[PDB]
Scaffold this active site. Sequence first.
Site, short mmCIF file in Angstrom:
data_model
loop_
_atom_site.label_atom_id
_atom_site.label_comp_id
_atom_site.label_asym_id
_atom_site.label_seq_id
_atom_site.Cartn_x
_atom_site.Cartn_y
_atom_site.Cartn_z
N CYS A 12 -82.72 -7.15 -24.49
CA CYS A 12 -83.18 -7.35 -23.04
C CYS A 12 -83.49 -5.89 -22.66
N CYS A 40 -85.62 -8.62 -20.98
CA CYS A 40 -85.39 -8.66 -19.59
C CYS A 40 -86.08 -7.33 -18.80
N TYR A 58 -88.98 -21.04 -21.29
CA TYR A 58 -88.85 -20.26 -20.17
C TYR A 58 -89.64 -18.86 -20.48
N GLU A 60 -92.84 -17.57 -18.27
CA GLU A 60 -93.00 -16.31 -17.63
C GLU A 60 -94.34 -15.31 -18.22
N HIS A 87 -82.96 -16.00 9.64
CA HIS A 87 -84.08 -16.45 9.96
C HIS A 87 -85.07 -15.24 10.07
N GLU A 101 -82.50 -19.55 3.91
CA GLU A 101 -81.89 -20.52 4.88
C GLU A 101 -82.03 -21.80 4.79
C1 LIG Z 1 -89.05 -12.04 -23.73
C2 LIG Z 1 -87.65 -12.02 -23.41
C3 LIG Z 1 -87.06 -12.00 -22.04
C4 LIG Z 1 -85.89 -12.01 -21.60
N1 LIG Z 1 -85.60 -12.03 -20.21
C5 LIG Z 1 -84.10 -12.26 -19.77
C6 LIG Z 1 -83.77 -11.95 -18.55
O1 LIG Z 1 -84.64 -11.45 -17.72
N2 LIG Z 1 -82.48 -12.18 -18.22
C7 LIG Z 1 -81.53 -12.31 -19.24
O2 LIG Z 1 -80.25 -12.57 -18.74
N3 LIG Z 1 -82.00 -12.54 -20.28
C8 LIG Z 1 -83.21 -12.25 -20.93
N4 LIG Z 1 -83.53 -12.52 -22.28
C9 LIG Z 1 -82.44 -12.76 -23.05
C10 LIG Z 1 -81.56 -11.54 -23.40
O3 LIG Z 1 -82.74 -10.72 -23.91
C11 LIG Z 1 -80.64 -12.03 -24.75
O4 LIG Z 1 -79.77 -13.03 -24.23
C12 LIG Z 1 -79.76 -10.84 -24.95
O5 LIG Z 1 -80.36 -9.57 -25.18
C13 LIG Z 1 -78.73 -11.36 -26.21
O6 LIG Z 1 -77.73 -10.05 -26.24
P1 LIG Z 1 -77.18 -9.74 -27.67
O7 LIG Z 1 -76.24 -8.93 -27.46
O8 LIG Z 1 -76.83 -11.13 -28.05
O9 LIG Z 1 -78.26 -9.50 -28.56
P2 LIG Z 1 -79.55 -8.38 -28.35
O10 LIG Z 1 -79.61 -7.72 -27.15
O11 LIG Z 1 -80.66 -9.02 -29.06
O12 LIG Z 1 -79.13 -7.20 -29.10
C14 LIG Z 1 -78.62 -7.42 -30.88
C15 LIG Z 1 -78.95 -6.10 -31.37
O13 LIG Z 1 -78.37 -6.11 -32.87
C16 LIG Z 1 -79.08 -5.24 -33.64
N5 LIG Z 1 -79.07 -5.72 -35.09
C17 LIG Z 1 -79.25 -6.71 -35.60
N6 LIG Z 1 -78.60 -6.97 -36.96
C18 LIG Z 1 -78.40 -5.76 -37.12
C19 LIG Z 1 -77.49 -5.01 -38.03
N7 LIG Z 1 -76.97 -5.75 -38.99
N8 LIG Z 1 -77.20 -3.81 -38.06
C20 LIG Z 1 -77.37 -3.06 -36.75
N9 LIG Z 1 -77.97 -3.43 -35.80
C21 LIG Z 1 -78.44 -4.82 -36.06
C22 LIG Z 1 -80.70 -5.59 -33.01
O14 LIG Z 1 -81.54 -4.52 -33.46
C23 LIG Z 1 -80.25 -5.52 -31.66
O15 LIG Z 1 -80.67 -4.44 -31.01
C24 LIG Z 1 -84.63 -12.20 -22.57
C25 LIG Z 1 -85.15 -12.45 -23.95
C26 LIG Z 1 -86.57 -12.33 -24.36
C27 LIG Z 1 -86.95 -12.26 -25.87
C1 LIG Z 2 -89.59 -8.71 18.24
C2 LIG Z 2 -88.74 -9.63 18.20
C3 LIG Z 2 -88.25 -9.94 16.88
C4 LIG Z 2 -87.27 -10.97 16.76
N1 LIG Z 2 -86.90 -11.09 15.42
C5 LIG Z 2 -86.05 -11.89 15.01
C6 LIG Z 2 -85.87 -12.25 13.55
O1 LIG Z 2 -86.45 -11.82 12.73
N2 LIG Z 2 -84.79 -13.20 13.26
C7 LIG Z 2 -83.74 -13.69 14.48
O2 LIG Z 2 -82.96 -14.37 13.94
N3 LIG Z 2 -84.05 -13.38 15.90
C8 LIG Z 2 -85.23 -12.39 15.96
N4 LIG Z 2 -85.35 -12.22 17.35
C9 LIG Z 2 -84.42 -12.80 18.14
C10 LIG Z 2 -84.88 -14.28 18.76
O3 LIG Z 2 -86.35 -14.40 18.85
C11 LIG Z 2 -84.20 -14.71 19.85
O4 LIG Z 2 -82.77 -14.38 19.59
C12 LIG Z 2 -84.37 -16.37 20.23
O5 LIG Z 2 -85.67 -16.44 20.47
C13 LIG Z 2 -83.62 -16.55 21.42
O6 LIG Z 2 -83.53 -17.95 21.57
P1 LIG Z 2 -83.42 -18.47 23.01
O7 LIG Z 2 -83.30 -19.99 23.04
O8 LIG Z 2 -82.14 -18.03 23.89
O9 LIG Z 2 -84.76 -18.14 23.83
P2 LIG Z 2 -86.06 -18.03 23.69
O10 LIG Z 2 -86.56 -18.09 22.19
O11 LIG Z 2 -86.65 -16.27 24.25
O12 LIG Z 2 -86.78 -18.90 24.53
C14 LIG Z 2 -86.69 -19.05 25.97
C15 LIG Z 2 -87.96 -20.01 26.58
O13 LIG Z 2 -87.53 -20.11 27.90
C16 LIG Z 2 -88.85 -20.06 28.46
N5 LIG Z 2 -88.52 -20.28 29.84
C17 LIG Z 2 -87.82 -19.27 30.49
N6 LIG Z 2 -87.57 -19.43 32.00
C18 LIG Z 2 -88.16 -20.69 32.07
C19 LIG Z 2 -88.12 -21.61 33.13
N7 LIG Z 2 -87.39 -21.28 34.41
N8 LIG Z 2 -88.71 -22.62 33.00
C20 LIG Z 2 -89.28 -23.15 31.82
N9 LIG Z 2 -89.31 -22.31 30.75
C21 LIG Z 2 -88.88 -21.05 30.86
C22 LIG Z 2 -89.47 -19.20 27.91
O14 LIG Z 2 -90.98 -19.08 28.17
C23 LIG Z 2 -89.09 -19.24 26.53
O15 LIG Z 2 -90.21 -19.78 25.72
C24 LIG Z 2 -86.36 -11.17 17.51
C25 LIG Z 2 -86.85 -10.99 18.81
C26 LIG Z 2 -87.89 -10.12 19.27
C27 LIG Z 2 -88.20 -9.92 20.80
#
Ligand SMILES: Cc1cc2nc3c(=O)[nH]c(=O)nc-3n(C[C@H](O)[C@H](O)[C@H](O)COP(=O)(O)OP(=O)(O)OC[C@H]3O[C@@H](n4cnc5c(N)ncnc54)[C@H](O)[C@@H]3O)c2cc1C
Ligand SMILES: Cc1cc2nc3c(=O)[nH]c(=O)nc-3n(C[C@H](O)[C@H](O)[C@H](O)COP(=O)(O)OP(=O)(O)OC[C@H]3O[C@@H](n4cnc5c(N)ncnc54)[C@H](O)[C@@H]3O)c2cc1C
Lengths: 448, 449
Positions: B41, B46, B176, B180, B438, B443
């Site tokens: 790993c 990994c 896998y 990758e 959101h 979500e």
């Molecule tokens: C390309 C690739 C990508 C991977 N990506 C992921 C990932 O992103 N996420 C994930 O969770 N898993 C990933 N894995 C799997 C993960 O690497 C293995 O499941 C994990 O390393 C296994 O752990 P282990 O302790 O069984 O053995 P290992 O980590 O292989 O270690 C065993 C060790 O024993 C040593 N050894 C062997 N025989 C002897 C000996 N007789 N004397 C002394 N030393 C010895 C070896 O040199 C080695 O260092 C990946 C594997 C590969 C090949």
């Molecule tokens: C810059 C910014 C970033 C934001 N980013 C996020 C985010 O990433 N995630 C998140 O969860 N929240 C975010 N929010 C908050 C989110 O936009 C508000 O909480 C959500 O829009 C509120 O919903 P509402 O129904 O109360 O009102 P609004 O969505 O504001 O809608 C009210 C509507 O009523 C209309 N209206 C008003 N009065 C009248 C009327 N009398 N007649 C008819 N139509 C009318 C308006 O035109 C408007 O369209 C953000 C807010 C801002 C300002």
Amino acid sequence: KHYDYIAIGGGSGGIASINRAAMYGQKCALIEAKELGGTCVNVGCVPKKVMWHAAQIREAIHMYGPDYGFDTTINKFNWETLIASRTAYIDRIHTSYENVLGKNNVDVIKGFARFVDAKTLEVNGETITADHILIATGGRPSHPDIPGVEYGIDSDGFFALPALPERVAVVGAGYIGVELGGVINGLGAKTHLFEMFDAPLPSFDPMISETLVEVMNAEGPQLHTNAIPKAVVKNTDGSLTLELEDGRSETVDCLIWAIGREPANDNINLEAAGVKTNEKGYIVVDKYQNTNIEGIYAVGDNTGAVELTPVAVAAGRRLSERLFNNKPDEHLDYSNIPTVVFSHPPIGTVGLTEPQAREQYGDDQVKVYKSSFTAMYTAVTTHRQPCRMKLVCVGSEEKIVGIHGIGFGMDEMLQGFAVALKMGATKKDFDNTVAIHPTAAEEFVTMR
Amino acid sequence: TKHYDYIAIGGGSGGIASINRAAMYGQKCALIEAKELGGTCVNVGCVPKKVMWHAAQIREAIHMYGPDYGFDTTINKFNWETLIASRTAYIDRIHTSYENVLGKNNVDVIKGFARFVDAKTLEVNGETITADHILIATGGRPSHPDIPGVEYGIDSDGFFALPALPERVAVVGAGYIGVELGGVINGLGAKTHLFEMFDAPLPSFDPMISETLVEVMNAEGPQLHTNAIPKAVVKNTDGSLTLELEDGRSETVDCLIWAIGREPANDNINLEAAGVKTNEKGYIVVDKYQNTNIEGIYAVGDNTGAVELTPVAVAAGRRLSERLFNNKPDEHLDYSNIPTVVFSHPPIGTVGLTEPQAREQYGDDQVKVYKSSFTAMYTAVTTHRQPCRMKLVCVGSEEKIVGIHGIGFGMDEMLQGFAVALKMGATKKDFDNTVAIHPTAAEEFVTMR
Ligand SMILES: Cc1cc2nc3c(=O)[nH]c(=O)nc-3n(C[C@H](O)[C@H](O)[C@H](O)COP(=O)(O)OP(=O)(O)OC[C@H]3O[C@@H](n4cnc5c(N)ncnc54)[C@H](O)[C@@H]3O)c2cc1C
Ligand SMILES: Cc1cc2nc3c(=O)[nH]c(=O)nc-3n(C[C@H](O)[C@H](O)[C@H](O)COP(=O)(O)OP(=O)(O)OC[C@H]3O[C@@H](n4cnc5c(N)ncnc54)[C@H](O)[C@@H]3O)c2cc1C
């Protein structure tokens, strides 16, 4: 015209509620003044995420690519090409929304609606009435009351920009200001972020604010805290100078206000229907989204609830289940709502921050597990970026009450962990799951 | 003779995991490793695979998606030596981290190849060492086909040793590892061919995954050739290679990588002196608790024929040390519902039963499948739009989730949390009752209808 159910606002809450009601045999109308999809599709979630991906590509080219062996020249960054691609995508989304409301037989009325009385609305000269009316009008950007406020734009204007300005100031630093500052910095502008408090994202777990300060100091935007705007001066050459209460000043080409949003509940004659709003202008609703007037409901940003699209969608769908599918207690639990911030790097958080858990359960009951490591994508480069994760546990059983992380991968990993927290996962549940390697997510099931 | 409480043969994923955990309970340990710490790993698995996958992602961002986002870019030079140097320095720093922890735990690390002298004695570098408990964690190695010309092909170890990227590459095997490597080499710019012996790549995965992979390779490369049974490899005058297939197809390439399988490294360690039994395929046979047939000898990892993943060798190795040295007599690893991510283009995430498997096991009438298909948002604004497809496999009235499968951008980071919820006995209602995040790919799993 008479309807069973009308939603005012074709945004996140409005579309979700009306489509679910339409499934139960209700005759429905949706009223929207501007574009279907609301703030999220048009000037919010979706165009923000496209611009975030554009910043990630430019950073892959310019910042990380050289240490992976790619000597690249960006000959031109064509802003118009990016805006055209983004706009065509939002246009295809508009067409998919029209198709769903259409198949559901929902009447979509394009116009601005105002109340006549508790059961009657006027839109475009015509009067329509219904027995159940949902107000889902969302909010709009707030602007400071200071000299020169009109030279700055807000997040809506950011999405309408004709070119990327050379020097940009973002004022606010709540999650929208942090996201926009990260994207604009990433696209190459000289960017300043002015935060009025002493730390960006002050209500988030302190691990998150502290890590954001660190990468901002290494990678930009240039952070300025305790910064309260006093005035904006437009200079003869066209540039703007931002003046702070404390005396600092900064000259930039574009200034974006990201200080907060306010509810758009004001010009729809709520007074006639008798619906009560609170001091901040939000419609007051109970646990079931009922206003004080029987037959009128509100969901979304206009209620003062957390401003997230999935929250408006789930509260809107559950409201239609309660009203039209006989589930009288159906309602959204507003606790443990997951949030991802598309900052650089992204933030994922759900549940209680460590201060919150400690105030609520006492230090005695709280065990916090933390992990800090370098994101593998960046580990082979001279631009290494931290990834920090925290699990907040309570009691002897170590029930997980908060999951927090900042780093590459946080945006996609948080959803399944939030399901698990909703199921009442304990640390033992995380530890008994086999890790997936190599990922950032496996850090949460191998913490010690 | 030096005498230890516990000795692990192999310093790979299983060996290091088990020995560090035993050392934490006061056991005096030795770790024997013939080549580099970290095993397959860290060194040829990994870790170098994921760095190469990030490199292909960066080239695709520059060359394939970047133009449609407005970046007109020229790759002035792709310096393969810089990439390999950065990759190698990172693996070296990981070697140091492992030595540090082993040193802190006072493990004696012995560099050499160990062989059994009898059931409690090993010989390494002429020295003889004995222990009360011996873990065999020797891993596996690349298999090679018995056909004319096999020697002209390299395997995945040789891929991590390449001096340069070849212009035309054939990968044989679409398990896998071949999938990758085929996607990484194609992403880095080489003309790449992937040859599969069967009808579809990843034939054991859910059919939705094999199908979407075929559609992506058709559009983006590598060029897939199925029902490809290798007959011979011919080296040509100019030094290129021609792979000849049984049905008459042939293909000329500069480099050919065999990715047909891996076999256990259990054959040169004189297992017969210890009396340990292996099966017909050469794997050491172990029970539930990793015991071999000889009391005091255990085996974990790839050499046992369990699923070949690092997390499984690590978890089985740690739980074996808990059992032996921390009084948890029943501690062992549950081998079901192990999650897998494949770093293909796009990545794959799967845990639990495929839809075919669930239907055989529960019968058609008990199985309910939910599916979602959409375009990855990253690619949706470009002219190279790529599918994302997800599937939930549910059983019974309660719709208990028994399989979660997806292929698309985001699958690599989103699966861990859903695997925790699956282990918790999640039903579709538990997914539906969680508020969505959101805008994300993840979500989709909590909004399926
Ligand atoms: C390309 C690739 C990508 C991977 N990506 C992921 C990932 O992103 N996420 C994930 O969770 N898993 C990933 N894995 C799997 C993960 O690497 C293995 O499941 C994990 O390393 C296994 O752990 P282990 O302790 O069984 O053995 P290992 O980590 O292989 O270690 C065993 C060790 O024993 C040593 N050894 C062997 N025989 C002897 C000996 N007789 N004397 C002394 N030393 C010895 C070896 O040199 C080695 O260092 C990946 C594997 C590969 C090949
Ligand atoms: C810059 C910014 C970033 C934001 N980013 C996020 C985010 O990433 N995630 C998140 O969860 N929240 C975010 N929010 C908050 C989110 O936009 C508000 O909480 C959500 O829009 C509120 O919903 P509402 O129904 O109360 O009102 P609004 O969505 O504001 O809608 C009210 C509507 O009523 C209309 N209206 C008003 N009065 C009248 C009327 N009398 N007649 C008819 N139509 C009318 C308006 O035109 C408007 O369209 C953000 C807010 C801002 C300002």
